Design an enzyme around this catalytic site. Structure first.
Site, PDB file in Angstrom:
ATOM      1  N   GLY A  21      -2.253   1.298   1.651  1.00 52.11           N
ATOM      2  CA  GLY A  21      -1.376   2.246   2.298  1.00 52.11           C
ATOM      3  C   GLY A  21       0.030   1.750   2.564  1.00 52.11           C
ATOM      4  CG  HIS A  49       1.307   5.063  -6.864  1.00 54.68           C
ATOM      5  ND1 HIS A  49       2.109   3.953  -6.729  1.00 54.68           N
ATOM      6  CD2 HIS A  49       0.466   5.051  -5.800  1.00 54.68           C
ATOM      7  CE1 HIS A  49       1.778   3.303  -5.627  1.00 54.68           C
ATOM      8  NE2 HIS A  49       0.792   3.954  -5.039  1.00 54.68           N
ATOM      9  CB  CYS A  86       2.701   2.224  -1.823  1.00 58.31           C
ATOM     10  SG  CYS A  86       1.834   1.036  -2.840  1.00 58.31           S
TER      11      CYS A  86
HETATM   12  C1  LIG Z   1      -4.481  -4.247  -6.033  1.00 56.25           C
HETATM   13  C2  LIG Z   1      -4.585  -2.846  -6.655  1.00 56.25           C
HETATM   14  C3  LIG Z   1      -5.581  -3.427  -7.676  1.00 56.25           C
HETATM   15  C4  LIG Z   1      -5.698  -1.885  -6.215  1.00 56.25           C
HETATM   16  C5  LIG Z   1      -3.650  -2.446  -7.806  1.00 56.25           C
HETATM   17  N1  LIG Z   1      -3.091  -3.576  -8.561  1.00 56.25           N
HETATM   18  C6  LIG Z   1      -3.058  -3.566  -9.904  1.00 56.25           C
HETATM   19  O1  LIG Z   1      -3.538  -2.659 -10.585  1.00 56.25           O
HETATM   20  C7  LIG Z   1      -2.386  -4.773 -10.578  1.00 56.25           C
HETATM   21  F1  LIG Z   1      -3.245  -5.794 -10.665  1.00 56.25           F
HETATM   22  F2  LIG Z   1      -1.977  -4.409 -11.793  1.00 56.25           F
HETATM   23  F3  LIG Z   1      -1.352  -5.136  -9.895  1.00 56.25           F
HETATM   24  C8  LIG Z   1      -2.464  -1.802  -7.092  1.00 56.25           C
HETATM   25  O2  LIG Z   1      -1.769  -2.465  -6.327  1.00 56.25           O
HETATM   26  N2  LIG Z   1      -2.287  -0.496  -7.269  1.00 56.25           N
HETATM   27  C9  LIG Z   1      -3.079   0.439  -8.106  1.00 56.25           C
HETATM   28  C10 LIG Z   1      -2.236   1.727  -8.218  1.00 56.25           C
HETATM   29  C11 LIG Z   1      -1.090   1.604  -7.264  1.00 56.25           C
HETATM   30  C12 LIG Z   1      -1.193   0.218  -6.568  1.00 56.25           C
HETATM   31  C13 LIG Z   1      -1.534   0.316  -5.209  1.00 56.25           C
HETATM   32  O3  LIG Z   1      -2.693   0.533  -4.859  1.00 56.25           O
HETATM   33  N3  LIG Z   1      -0.533   0.080  -4.327  1.00 56.25           N
HETATM   34  C14 LIG Z   1      -0.759   0.105  -2.868  1.00 56.25           C
HETATM   35  C15 LIG Z   1       0.178   1.150  -2.243  1.00 56.25           C
HETATM   36  N4  LIG Z   1      -0.206   1.676  -1.076  1.00 56.25           N
HETATM   37  C16 LIG Z   1      -0.436  -1.287  -2.253  1.00 56.25           C
HETATM   38  C17 LIG Z   1      -1.474  -2.386  -2.588  1.00 56.25           C
HETATM   39  C18 LIG Z   1      -2.794  -2.103  -1.869  1.00 56.25           C
HETATM   40  C19 LIG Z   1      -3.388  -3.508  -1.844  1.00 56.25           C
HETATM   41  N5  LIG Z   1      -2.161  -4.322  -1.583  1.00 56.25           N
HETATM   42  C20 LIG Z   1      -1.106  -3.639  -2.038  1.00 56.25           C
HETATM   43  O4  LIG Z   1       0.044  -4.075  -1.965  1.00 56.25           O
HETATM   44  C21 LIG Z   1      -0.893   1.551  -8.689  1.00 56.25           C
HETATM   45  C22 LIG Z   1      -0.243   0.582  -9.565  1.00 56.25           C
HETATM   46  C23 LIG Z   1      -0.329   2.894  -9.185  1.00 56.25           C
END
Ligand SMILES: CC(C)(C)[C@H](NC(=O)C(F)(F)F)C(=O)N1C[C@H]2[C@@H]([C@H]1C(=O)N[C@H](C=N)C[C@@H]1CCNC1=O)C2(C)C
Ligand SMILES: CC(C)(C)[C@H](NC(=O)C(F)(F)F)C(=O)N1C[C@H]2[C@@H]([C@H]1C(=O)N[C@H](C=N)C[C@@H]1CCNC1=O)C2(C)C
EC number: 3.4.19.12
Lengths: 299, 302
Positions: free
Chosen positions: B141, B39, B143
């Protein structure tokens, strides 16, 4: 909401093994000096009642074997500073980080890199308890493992491990060799002062519970700082100062819960108990997260 | 008894940052390949409903900014494997440890090196829950942060971080890009399923108690494995596998308490509670220490 240690790599590159006779432990190699607990010079019998200045004068540089991985470092000098031995070696450590030696205050936290035979084993977070012990995890051969905090690539070393008390808690020194607490590096029965709970840390942790959506312990009661401190003292909690109130400012602003309002909740927690319920998954009130630790993890 | 992470140095030397567009996350640099969550190629609007195959077609090597610190590593090839991107770079990482990629089972623990902008920030121990989430600490950030175990200088990478669920728990993939659990890397309404208690780890905790002399719960009963599994599930406990029975072997041998005797002791705890007494000074039964974690902590492993 987890206890989180600092990455240990900058410290791992400093760990070595120090042997005198049949006594082996860890040392900390910074530039051309290795720091280690002075009891490395004791035979297991000497540890029962050591005269360190007498024991040390009977040692030469060649009595110290320092191993960095597989490579031996030649000891070209030695001196004792309080309960720490400083071995000058013929090689400077190329992985020496930017570092400082600091003596920490009770209630502050640090990361421990537990080591055996100069090799890192595990990393975890500890707090300096008010009675100057730490609740660590250390076995035979762990002495010379260090505690530290990391700030923008500067490692502040604050603890070197020396001993385990009969209650299972741990005692050690700063990197100048001065013990935290009224302990001595002699193998003899020693007890700590009665411990107490780090109030400002419990409050920080309750703020973490609210940020994570858990509010069952909150109330509408109020308290003054003095009245809260009277109850805290009654329950073997440390006093809460105005500086602690100030330090809790950001967490108070983030959650909109006034510090003295959170104090009122804690007072009832101490007076009513937790009625078998939990907070952040814990059945006890947690006091090993500083306000800084809580902000660093929530923000 | 406390949660001990592995020393993180061997992994710290492998963390880089990967940016595509304005989205920066972390990558893992091993030999001449950087692994990161796919992503990274999405815009904020893309994440709501991404077509990864078509979004990747629209990217080239020169769209990827990979940096070790602030030093750019030139990307010379890219491919997608499940939910991970593999970016070939022109420099082999001199800090690459001996490593393997492994897919762990629920109940198994690992250390997480939380990273931001390619810079390691903290380390902590996590258990994979039966519902395939970890109770982690991950902010924006994070991920591409990884989870790992070490054995004799071989780093086994088992987790890469992708997302946070509404209950605050975290989900991600193995290093081949296959998610643990039913999660997908789309910003869509997803939820952690109902969770259960990790029976094998509770048992390891009971053996750790016994090793330290806290053994009031050892009873005079035994059970068969099938009987225990059927009852444990009535208490929201996981059933035991044959592998679970075998991983408890060492602690059984050290204490002399048979695995099925300990199962009977745990069954009594589930059926009658603690009665105001503690085990290892806790009224709660801990389930995030594996049998290996108990032995690792009670011995002086490396
Ligand atoms: C919580 C957030 C709602 C915004 C969303 N969650 C859901 O959509 C769910 F509810 F389906 F899980 C979600 O995590 N993402 C949305 C988007 C990526 C991922 C994401 O932002 N990853 C971050 C990587 N840097 C780590 C996050 C940041 C907060 N704490 C973490 O660990 C993807 C699935 C492609
Ligand atoms: C528990 C032991 C009773 C044996 C003793 N304790 C007390 O005598 C006390 F009661 F005073 F604390 C004690 O620790 N030592 C005895 C001897 C050194 C120290 C020691 O062996 N240190 C070890 C360093 N490698 C780390 C220990 C090992 C077990 N877990 C640890 O952390 C010194 C004080 C000189």
């Amino acid at each position: 909401f987890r206890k989180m240690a600092f990455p240990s790599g900058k410290v791992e590159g400093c760990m070595v093994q120090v042997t005198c006779g049949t006594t082996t432990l860890n040392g900390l190699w910074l530039d051309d000096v290795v720091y280690c607990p002075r009891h490395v010079i004791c035979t297991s019998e000497d540890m029962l009642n050591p005269n360190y200045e007498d024991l040390l004068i009977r040692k030469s540089n060649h009595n110290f074997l320092v191993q960095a991985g597989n490579v031996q470092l030649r000891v070209i000098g030695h001196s004792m500073q309080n309960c720490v031995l400083k071995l000058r070696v013929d090689t400077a450590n190329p992985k020496t980080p930017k570092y400082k030696f600091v003596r920490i205050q009770p209630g502050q936290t640090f990361s421990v890199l537990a080591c055996y035979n100069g090799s890192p084993s595990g990393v975890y977070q500890c707090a300096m308890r008010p009675n100057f012990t730490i609740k660590g995890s250390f076995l035979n051969g762990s002495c010379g493992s260090v505690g530290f905090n990391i700030d923008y690539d500067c490692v502040s070393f604050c603890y070197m491990h020396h001993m385990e008390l009969p209650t299972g808690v741990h005692a050690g020194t700063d990197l100048e060799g001065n013990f935290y607490g009224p302990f001595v590096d002699r193998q003899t029965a020693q007890a700590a002062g009665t411990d107490t709970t780090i109030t400002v840390n419990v409050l920080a942790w309750l703020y973490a519970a609210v940020i994570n959506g858990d509010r069952w312990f909150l109330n509408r009661f109020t308290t003054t700082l003095n009245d809260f401190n009277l109850v805290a003292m009654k329950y073997n909690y440390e006093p809460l100062t105005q500086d602690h109130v100030d330090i809790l400012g950001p967490l108070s602003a983030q959650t909109g819960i006034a510090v003295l309002d959170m104090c009122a909740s804690l007072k009832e927690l101490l007076q009513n108990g937790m009625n078998g319920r939990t907070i952040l998954g814990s059945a006890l009130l947690e006091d090993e997260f500083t306000p800084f630790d809580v902000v660093r993890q929530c923000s």
